[PDB]
Symmetry: C3
């Protein structure tokens, strides 16, 4: 079917998520509360939204660039399942030594509806061999 | 058809399971006890090797409970479709509280993300 | 429509992104500068690239595992819109007590062209119910 993104407001403070540029990846999420993210700490910021996205996708809470370089803010967790109908919370980590203030309505993250596959796991005794093989953790160099 | 092939590397390994019916992720279990030091990191073995299809990769993604309760985040996390080595999970501990992972704990979730991998075309103008 | 990944060098310090293995998810990104990511701090590292990827995708700047494990480096931000035509910057956090040196040409992140959907958002009074838990 056609993809969709449906949102239900859980309070008046909720804000409809907002696209950026026309080919933009995400929908900006706004805080439904006044809060803060403590220096070198974390916070759970409610959006007061419940959402629905299609089977074969999930909604990823992803970081905004401005907040990253200006405030050292990153998004923790962030995997919203397509069948999750509870309140959507944004987990922020503050990797700086100053508290980050959040006012209600402030755009604190961006939601991206990522395409995925979910096949049944097939357990095998052997896998195919490749060029990469067991190479990882810097095997291709600096 | 998409696939997710999993090879157990030891009897400590657990076949990943999805936590809910339409869930994005297959939960990954730790094959060891391990300390994740405050403001530090740990590399946790799953004792699994995997294969996913060309046109996808396996992303090691953070679980919400570990993040919210324990300030745990997943570093790195890009498992290439051609990687046949052991899948390892990098955890960062973004708190001043030392934390301990126990054998069998679900410490991350694997998501098989759809991607494209075209050959790069260099241009002087992008549109 | 066939996917593409168009790249424009903004300087001679830019490097065309390359796949680290034949079926790699990502294209490695090189620093166009000598810089550093301070201990417990951050840096924006220019690539001197502008890029374009298709509608229905975005370019994700993602962390390399070697740098993550050896140097506690992680990638912040990282969402490059398919219609973004400015310079592509890599935002790095350093989660260790040791400064991390960046030399020009060092591969400091990887770019993954992730498939997405971008439907028009709609507010509803009631969502469809699901059996969860
Ligand atoms: O950042 C987040 C992450 C998750 N969530 C919600 C939606 C998601 O479908 C649901 C479960 O998230 P995780 O699977 O990542 N957390 P965990 O595995 O610890 O809990 P559970 O056992 O319920 O799956 O929590 C948020 O609201 N914000
Ligand atoms: O979290 C991770 C990340 C990577 N890996 C493995 C699988 C992956 O295909 C391989 C290489 O990952 P990256 O390309 O993201 N890191 P890096 O570029 O430093 O390693 P390499 O030079 O080998 O490509 O390491 C893990 O086991 N866990
Ligand atoms: O890591 C990044 C992230 C973004 N960017 C560029 C490309 C992206 O399309 C553009 C905007 O990214 P964000 O939406 O994450 N930033 P923000 O929401 O703060 O600002 P804007 O008003 O431009 O959307 O900045 C980078 O170069 N590196
Ligand atoms: Mg934006
Ligand atoms: Mg879960
Ligand atoms: Mg690599």
């Amino acid at each position: 079917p056609s993809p969709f993104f449906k949102v239900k407001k859980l309070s008046e403070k909720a804000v409809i998520p907002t696209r950026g540029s026309p080919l933009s990846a995400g929908y900006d999420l706004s805080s439904a509360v006044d809060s803060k993210v403590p220096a070198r700490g974390k916070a759970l910021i409610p959006t007061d939204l419940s959402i629905a996205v299609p089977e074969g996708t999930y909604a990823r809470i992803a970081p905004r660039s401005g907040l990253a370089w200006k405030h050292s803010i990153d998004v923790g967790a962030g995997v919203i399942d397509a069948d999750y109908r509870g309140p959507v919370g944004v987990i922020l980590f503050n990797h700086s030594d100053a508290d980050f203030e959040v006012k209600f309505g402030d755009r604190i993250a961006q939601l991206i509806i990522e395409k995925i596959v979910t096949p049944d796991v097939v357990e095998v005794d052997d896998l195919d061999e490749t060029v990469r093989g067991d190479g990882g953790f810097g095997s291709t160099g600096v």
